[PDB]
Amino acid sequence: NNKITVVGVGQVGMACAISILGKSLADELALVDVLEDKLKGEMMDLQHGSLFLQTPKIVADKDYSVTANSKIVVVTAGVRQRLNLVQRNVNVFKFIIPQIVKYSPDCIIIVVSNPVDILTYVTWKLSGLPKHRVIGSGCNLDSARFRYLMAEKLGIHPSSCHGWILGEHGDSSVAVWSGVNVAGVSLQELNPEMGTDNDSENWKEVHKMVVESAYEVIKLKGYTNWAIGLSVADLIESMLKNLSRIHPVSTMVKGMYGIENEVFLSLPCILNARGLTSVINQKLKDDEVAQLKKSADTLWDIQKDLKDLENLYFQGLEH
Amino acid sequence: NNKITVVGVGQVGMACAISILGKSLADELALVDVLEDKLKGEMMDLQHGSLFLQTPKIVADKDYSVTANSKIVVVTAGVVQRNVNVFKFIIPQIVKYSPDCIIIVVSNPVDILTYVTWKLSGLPKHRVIGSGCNLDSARFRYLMAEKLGIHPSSCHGWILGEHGDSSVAVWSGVNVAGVSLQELNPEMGTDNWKEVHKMVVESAYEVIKLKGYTNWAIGLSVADLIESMLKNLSRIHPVSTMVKGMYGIENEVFLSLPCILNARGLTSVINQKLKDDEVAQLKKSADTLWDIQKDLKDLENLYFQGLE
Amino acid sequence: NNKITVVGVGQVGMACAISILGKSLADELALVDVLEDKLKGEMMDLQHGSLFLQTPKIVADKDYSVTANSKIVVVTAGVRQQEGESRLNLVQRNVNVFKFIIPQIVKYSPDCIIIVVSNPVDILTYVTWKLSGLPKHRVIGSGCNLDSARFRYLMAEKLGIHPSSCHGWILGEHGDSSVAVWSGVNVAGVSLQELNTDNDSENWKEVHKMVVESAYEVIKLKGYTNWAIGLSVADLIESMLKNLSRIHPVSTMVKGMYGIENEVFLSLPCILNARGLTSVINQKLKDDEVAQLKKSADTLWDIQKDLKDLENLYFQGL
Amino acid sequence: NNKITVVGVGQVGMACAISILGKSLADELALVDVLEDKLKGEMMDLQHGSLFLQTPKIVADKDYSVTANSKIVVVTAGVRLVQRNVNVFKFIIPQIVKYSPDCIIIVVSNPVDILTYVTWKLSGLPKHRVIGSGCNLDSARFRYLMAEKLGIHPSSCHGWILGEHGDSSVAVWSGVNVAGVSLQELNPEMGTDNDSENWKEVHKMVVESAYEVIKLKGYTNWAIGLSVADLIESMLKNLSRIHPVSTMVKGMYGIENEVFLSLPCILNARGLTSVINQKLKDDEVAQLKKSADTLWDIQKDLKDLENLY
Numbered sequence A: 001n002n003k004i005t006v007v008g009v010g011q012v013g014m015a016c017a018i019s020i021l022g023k024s025l026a027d028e029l030a031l032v033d034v035l036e037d038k039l040k041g042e043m044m045d046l047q048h049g050s051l052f053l054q055t056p057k058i059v060a061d062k063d064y065s066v067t068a069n070s071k072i073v074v075v076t077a078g079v080r081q082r083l084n085l086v087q088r089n090v091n092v093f094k095f096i097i098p099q100i101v102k103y104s105p106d107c108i109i110i111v112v113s114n115p116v117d118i119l120t121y122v123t124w125k126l127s128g129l130p131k132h133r134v135i136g137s138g139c140n141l142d143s144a145r146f147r148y149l150m151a152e153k154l155g156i157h158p159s160s161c162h163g164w165i166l167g168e169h170g171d172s173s174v175a176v177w178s179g180v181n182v183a184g185v186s187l188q189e190l191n192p193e194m195g196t197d198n199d200s201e202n203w204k205e206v207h208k209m210v211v212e213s214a215y216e217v218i219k220l221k222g223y224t225n226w227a228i229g230l231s232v233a234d235l236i237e238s239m240l241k242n243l244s245r246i247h248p249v250s251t252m253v254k255g256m257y258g259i260e261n262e263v264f265l266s267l268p269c270i271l272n273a274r275g276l277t278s279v280i281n282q283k284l285k286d287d288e289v290a291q292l293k294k295s296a297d298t299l300w301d302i303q304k305d306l307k308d309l310e311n312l313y314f315q316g317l318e319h
Numbered sequence B: 001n002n003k004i005t006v007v008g009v010g011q012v013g014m015a016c017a018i019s020i021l022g023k024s025l026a027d028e029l030a031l032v033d034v035l036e037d038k039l040k041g042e043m044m045d046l047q048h049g050s051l052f053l054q055t056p057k058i059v060a061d062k063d064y065s066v067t068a069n070s071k072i073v074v075v076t077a078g079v080v081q082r083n084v085n086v087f088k089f090i091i092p093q094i095v096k097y098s099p100d101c102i103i104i105v106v107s108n109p110v111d112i113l114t115y116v117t118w119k120l121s122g123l124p125k126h127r128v129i130g131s132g133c134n135l136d137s138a139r140f141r142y143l144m145a146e147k148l149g150i151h152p153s154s155c156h157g158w159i160l161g162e163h164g165d166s167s168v169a170v171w172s173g174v175n176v177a178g179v180s181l182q183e184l185n186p187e188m189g190t191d192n193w194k195e196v197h198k199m200v201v202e203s204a205y206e207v208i209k210l211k212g213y214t215n216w217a218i219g220l221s222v223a224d225l226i227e228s229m230l231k232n233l234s235r236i237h238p239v240s241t242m243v244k245g246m247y248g249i250e251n252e253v254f255l256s257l258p259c260i261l262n263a264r265g266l267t268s269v270i271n272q273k274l275k276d277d278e279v280a281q282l283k284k285s286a287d288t289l290w291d292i293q294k295d296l297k298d299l300e301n302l303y304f305q306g307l308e
Numbered sequence C: 001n002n003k004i005t006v007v008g009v010g011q012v013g014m015a016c017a018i019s020i021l022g023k024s025l026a027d028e029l030a031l032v033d034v035l036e037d038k039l040k041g042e043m044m045d046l047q048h049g050s051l052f053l054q055t056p057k058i059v060a061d062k063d064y065s066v067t068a069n070s071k072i073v074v075v076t077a078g079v080r081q082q083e084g085e086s087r088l089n090l091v092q093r094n095v096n097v098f099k100f101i102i103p104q105i106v107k108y109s110p111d112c113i114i115i116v117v118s119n120p121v122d123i124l125t126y127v128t129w130k131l132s133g134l135p136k137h138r139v140i141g142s143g144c145n146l147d148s149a150r151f152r153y154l155m156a157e158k159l160g161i162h163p164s165s166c167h168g169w170i171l172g173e174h175g176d177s178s179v180a181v182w183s184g185v186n187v188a189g190v191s192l193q194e195l196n197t198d199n200d201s202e203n204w205k206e207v208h209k210m211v212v213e214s215a216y217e218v219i220k221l222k223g224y225t226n227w228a229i230g231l232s233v234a235d236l237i238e239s240m241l242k243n244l245s246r247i248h249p250v251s252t253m254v255k256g257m258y259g260i261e262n263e264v265f266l267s268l269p270c271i272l273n274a275r276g277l278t279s280v281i282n283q284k285l286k287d288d289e290v291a292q293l294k295k296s297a298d299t300l301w302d303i304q305k306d307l308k309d310l311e312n313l314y315f316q317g318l
Numbered sequence D: 001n002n003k004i005t006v007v008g009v010g011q012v013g014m015a016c017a018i019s020i021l022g023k024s025l026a027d028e029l030a031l032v033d034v035l036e037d038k039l040k041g042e043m044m045d046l047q048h049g050s051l052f053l054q055t056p057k058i059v060a061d062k063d064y065s066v067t068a069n070s071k072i073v074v075v076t077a078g079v080r081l082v083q084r085n086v087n088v089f090k091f092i093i094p095q096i097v098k099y100s101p102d103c104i105i106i107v108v109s110n111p112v113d114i115l116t117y118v119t120w121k122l123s124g125l126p127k128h129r130v131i132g133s134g135c136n137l138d139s140a141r142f143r144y145l146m147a148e149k150l151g152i153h154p155s156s157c158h159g160w161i162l163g164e165h166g167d168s169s170v171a172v173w174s175g176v177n178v179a180g181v182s183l184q185e186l187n188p189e190m191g192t193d194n195d196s197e198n199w200k201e202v203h204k205m206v207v208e209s210a211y212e213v214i215k216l217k218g219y220t221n222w223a224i225g226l227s228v229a230d231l232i233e234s235m236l237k238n239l240s241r242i243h244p245v246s247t248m249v250k251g252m253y254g255i256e257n258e259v260f261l262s263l264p265c266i267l268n269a270r271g272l273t274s275v276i277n278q279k280l281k282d283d284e285v286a287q288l289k290k291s292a293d294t295l296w297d298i299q300k301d302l303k304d305l306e307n308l309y
């Protein structure tokens, strides 16, 4: 079978669930949340439209037993957008991550909750699963937003546009301008001043707008959901169909790019049935690798004092 | 060539939008609403996922000039507490900008608002249709699949009449694998099968009681009607249409009937006997549109409004 | 791992493979054939289109090692009908071919669902079931799934609607003695049997004869039939690999049913999912339908009881 | 509506037809061929499977009156150095524009670069409506060879093969890249005789893989069938995607002759919106001019009574 579990019947979870059923990727959809009513309501609503889909079974319950033998588990629980956010979201992940592995040992966890980069490391610690099976959303949407900003810029489809945004999902995202190209035309060679301050084509602004556009939409409708459901389902299609496609997702970066701390950052990785086949370790400019080490230093700065990651009880360890 | 305009960016509004984009049906998505912030925010979110879709352009604006030359217009806007006051502002404007178009009314009651849309638009009958009992039929086929352990597609059930209660369920048409389920149980739907029919009616009431609104079930059915129409498949669907002169009905009412849907809209309606107890429920539906809309407000927007 | 193997790179086989890749039902497509050049030729030709497909691995080799751990095996190998040949004439030839390809499939794919396409499908599904040793719920034949597709299309152009909106069920033997259950023929729930051998409506019985003559006509025109059957095979695979639990008219074991007394494979409405054939709908047909249904089984076993290749011992009796 | 005509019901012809039906692109498929039996048999075969398709009408006839009001016409008719197809194109191309002038013609018959030019003259249609198969298939074969050696999906590794559809092709090594990194940057000897990875042999296999297919099974079928289906989808949906189709190169890259060469172009409902003028290297522009020089000499033997207007 192809069982997929969605922990979160909110705006991002339902957008993800509707994208899974729209792609016929799952034969058994499992919805898990803490709201009894909202959980049963979204399940029945999805079940009523099961005639127009190809997912026979759609089970949903608060007990994680309905998630048994799931291939992929998409975690969308928590609260939206700061050390406060990560402190309270790891509080939720502490009660749901160990329960997912208890019923779905051979699954692939997809962390969506923000901060993704941090919560993916939190998920990898409490789950005990290999790092190649714990993948986070990361900059898979940052590259989609960047590729769309270039689509309406040149007048072509985002498919023909190729722009890679890596690093940390947020303002500290790295824009590898050497890979920005369409139709095999490296635009960095047309404009050698790409990314710097003295740039005719302010690509620095369109790079910043990738983070702004995410912040803006949260001001107008109050959230973001559709761009992720399509991005999350796009990752599962690469994984379930064994396509072995390269995607910029958050992965264990320690030991790569001169970083020594156990953190998760977005990098190109191949996705098949097993999860992360390999993590592309390309060569970046001196300034691009600077943010990779700086953001990882800031990421580890938070996770090192996360007392929700306690594997042992000997915690008279006050400081 | 395949421009689709969705009026309303609410729950049902975006449910059809994400379902239309999930099917590569429209090369142009136009969203309209009164709340420009939610209207602009929802459009920008769908745009960020353009890489994973096959729609070149997604536009949105309060002005209806952005909905010009649309092949399909889905009306999902809505607030005796009827929605004609809102319909008088959203309907005359879509036809002004896209005359040659097809209308899919979704606001409740579907059978009532679809008639006001046809009157305010002046378009023919085949181009003004509503969801009707297409969702009630899908809900009914799921209950048969849940009890029989098969797929709703392999199941076959036809719910007609009004959207919700007072709906008709043809028991002679209920069948699976060609086997008429009424033949195995001659006393089907009579003194259990009527609860299954009433469960369709109350399956929605439970949804709004839990999550507060019906969302994805309707959005998927609207995309199913759009696919069968934009592809000229000429498929049969139980949509709400004008049924004057059929089954002893002599009033301009809109009821759910099995109709053929394609690029020209509602070309034909399926002729059926419906026994005798079922034919009455269609005439018993004289409380819809008649009795209700005979005390209408103003199904014609006039500039003389120094009123209140 | 949704691995699919296609035995036979002929017209029907290639039409099945192109339909499987079109729907992205398999992540690993294995091809097996005796013609090694054509086998390797069709592989590279399909592999060049990997850019527009969703199947990463496309392997092909005459040895059945490339078929290990296959979920569904579509068998299209054998000799083809020729002009005005009879479907019951290609038996001794394709049964001898099935003698060397069916056992080899189970050796490398013990847990798999075999789909028989080679004609006569009703006879060879029985030969496969006996040669493979797998349960009857996993040895499924094409049956009348295509016969119903051609029937529901003929009534589609007649009523001006889509074949999907049409609802017709053709059961029995795939070919001449097909049983057209007119009691189940309906459109939008309206059983079009309002008309009630002669008049029908205009002739709601020539359409059945057209389903039988359609196969011969296409063979007389282009020489074979591959596209129509190729799409029907993909429809059955989609119902299995996706656990759709949909009802299809496929050939299955029908003993005990309709008074049939000996092991015979006939087409009946069956529910297909990941487990294969999980249920068979036993309708209550008219006395004329069960008579033609049973008659098709009498002639079927008559040809199966003498086949000198399913002999596992040394039967020198003539 | 989205009517599509496929001229020729042969192997390559039916590979496209079965591909357009598998994507629900057109609502009416029209087949045209000279053989009555094969044309009618292939038509009824597709009609029998109408249940599993989203195509209502499927027609076929000898006269081109059945192809009236078509949006895209795929010309895959001819014979698999002696141009026996320009004679056949004389009797079929004018018939297409006579019953459906407002359309887009996709040439598939080989030599495409020679026949797409022949189509452009007989049809008299704008250059943005005459499409040739070009190196879009050569790019798919090239991207697969990169995926075969890297263990990834062909859609993840990007490569652009331009020039002629055949032996004299151009591999823009400056456009090859996987995961956003320039493969030429990793190995600067890409394309030269000092290649550490022998990429010139990979380019040679692209123009030789088609030879192997015709040697094993006798013809190339499904590779081109899926390629044309990808170009039609980028057009019928106005996706505005960049594809290396065969287009005119007169004026650009210094060629002052009217020839057709494979170059990346934006495909949408109109056909060709733009033709990318990539700044190629010296050895690449030389081949694009050397091939265009000899190709015009091939299409200078217009003494099959074409001789311009």
Ligand SMILES: NC(=O)C1=CN([C@@H]2O[C@H](COP(=O)(O)OP(=O)(O)OC[C@H]3O[C@@H](n4cnc5c(N)ncnc54)[C@H](O)[C@@H]3O)[C@@H](O)[C@H]2O)C=CC1
Pocket (backbone or CB within 6 Å): A007, A008, A009, A010, A011, A012, A013, A032, A033, A034, A035, A076, A077, A078, A079, A080, A081, A092, A093, A095, A096, A112, A113, A114, A115, A116, A137, A138, A141, A169, A223, A224, A225, A228
């Ligand atoms: N990586 C990305 O691109 C983005 C990530 N997100 C993430 O989605 C998350 C929230 O999902 P949203 O739909 O935006 O808001 P939401 O208010 O709908 O929260 C999602 C669900 O989590 C539930 N929940 C909280 N704790 C739970 C627990 N212990 N067990 C089960 N359910 C629990 C809530 O009931 C809710 O239904 C946030 O962390 C947010 O950052 C959303 C936008 C962008």
Ligand SMILES: NC(=O)C1=CN([C@@H]2O[C@H](COP(=O)(O)OP(=O)(O)OC[C@H]3O[C@@H](n4cnc5c(N)ncnc54)[C@H](O)[C@@H]3O)[C@@H](O)[C@H]2O)C=CC1
Pocket (backbone or CB within 6 Å): B007, B008, B009, B010, B011, B012, B013, B032, B033, B034, B035, B076, B077, B078, B079, B086, B087, B089, B090, B105, B106, B107, B108, B109, B110, B131, B132, B135, B163, B213, B214, B215, B218
């Ligand atoms: N046909 C069916 O089976 C179903 C019926 N519905 C109907 O759909 C309608 C909307 O349902 P929801 O989306 O869940 O409520 P909603 O409040 O989330 O969306 C309704 C939309 O109307 C907009 N609106 C109101 N007046 C407008 C105007 N003059 N112009 C533009 N936009 C206007 C509001 O912005 C709103 O977004 C209701 O009438 C409801 O009864 C809901 C589910 C299924």
Ligand SMILES: NC(=O)C1=CN([C@@H]2O[C@H](COP(=O)(O)OP(=O)(O)OC[C@H]3O[C@@H](n4cnc5c(N)ncnc54)[C@H](O)[C@@H]3O)[C@@H](O)[C@H]2O)C=CC1
Pocket (backbone or CB within 6 Å): C007, C008, C009, C010, C011, C012, C013, C032, C033, C034, C035, C076, C077, C078, C079, C080, C081, C090, C097, C100, C101, C116, C117, C118, C119, C121, C142, C143, C146, C174, C224, C225, C226, C229
């Ligand atoms: N069940 C059904 O509904 C249908 C039945 N069919 C059947 O499909 C069959 C195939 O028709 P075609 O592909 O057009 O003729 P074909 O001449 O292409 O034969 C198919 C393949 O069998 C191969 N073959 C022969 N012995 C083999 C072996 N031992 N191992 C592997 N491959 C072997 C040949 O190389 C060939 O490529 C016919 O027997 C026909 O009756 C056709 C239409 C529908």
Ligand SMILES: NC(=O)C1=CN([C@@H]2O[C@H](COP(=O)(O)OP(=O)(O)OC[C@H]3O[C@@H](n4cnc5c(N)ncnc54)[C@H](O)[C@@H]3O)[C@@H](O)[C@H]2O)C=CC1
Pocket (backbone or CB within 6 Å): D007, D008, D009, D010, D011, D012, D013, D032, D033, D034, D035, D076, D077, D078, D079, D080, D085, D088, D091, D092, D108, D109, D110, D111, D112, D133, D134, D137, D165, D219, D220, D221, D224
């Ligand atoms: N661009 C590319 O990469 C490809 C090039 N091709 C070309 O496509 C052409 C056909 O290839 P195949 O289908 O495998 O050979 P084929 O002999 O099977 O089909 C060619 C069709 O032309 C028909 N025909 C001849 N004159 C006609 C006319 N005046 N009107 C209508 N039909 C006519 C024949 O009946 C035949 O069916 C060849 O020229 C070949 O070089 C083949 C594969 C791909």
